Design a protein around this ligand. Sequence first.
Ligand code: GDP
Ligand code: 0QR
Ligand code: MG
Length: 170
Amino acid sequence: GMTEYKLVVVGAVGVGKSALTIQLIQNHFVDEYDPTIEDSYRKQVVIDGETCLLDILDTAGQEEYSAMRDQYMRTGEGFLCVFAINNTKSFEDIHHYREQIKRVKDSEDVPMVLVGNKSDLPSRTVDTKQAQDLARSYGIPFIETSAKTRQGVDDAFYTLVREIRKHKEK
Ligand SMILES: Nc1nc2c(ncn2[C@@H]2O[C@H](COP(=O)(O)OP(=O)(O)O)[C@@H](O)[C@H]2O)c(=O)[nH]1
Ligand SMILES: Nc1cccc(NS(=O)(=O)c2ccc(F)cc2)n1
Ligand SMILES: [Mg+2]
């Protein structure tokens, strides 16, 4: 079979995880998607000449059993850590997602990309510089996205695939 990359999109409720995933897979912006629904989505794509399968888990936070959360973190190969540029709390939450994923995977080398979503909104409480400072500290890429206009969306997911490839070649 072609290579499949298991990606997981994490972050506070309301940041745009669903809107980002649906833009990537279906190429439309979704206004309202129930905040409590967690699903995975597949799309065949071509990234730097490689035909491959993205299998994206759009998370929604607490699970019926914590074992479920630990199971998708161990299965996931790379994680998009999303905050919204107008929600400082969602940015502060990134610390806990970075920690938790490394802790479950018991790894210091987990492919991740920091994503600051809703870049189309003039309303902003998290400046680019602050998010760059966090990404520099983690040694991972940082991309600002808009699920609404699609700006940065392919970049965020494809950069994550590229981080996964760097990890695999070691
Ligand atoms: N303006 C704008 N609104 C967005 C963006 N992404 C998501 N939203 C809206 O923010 C709200 C939460 O988005 P959703 O995808 O459900 O967030 P989730 O809880 O992380 O899955 C919804 O009303 C979306 O329409 C974006 O990039 N720009
Ligand atoms: N695309 C991905 C990424 C990580 C996990 C999965 N699927 S999975 O390991 O069966 C899974 C495990 C626990 C869940 F709550 C949801 C999905 N898919
Ligand atoms: Mg959602």
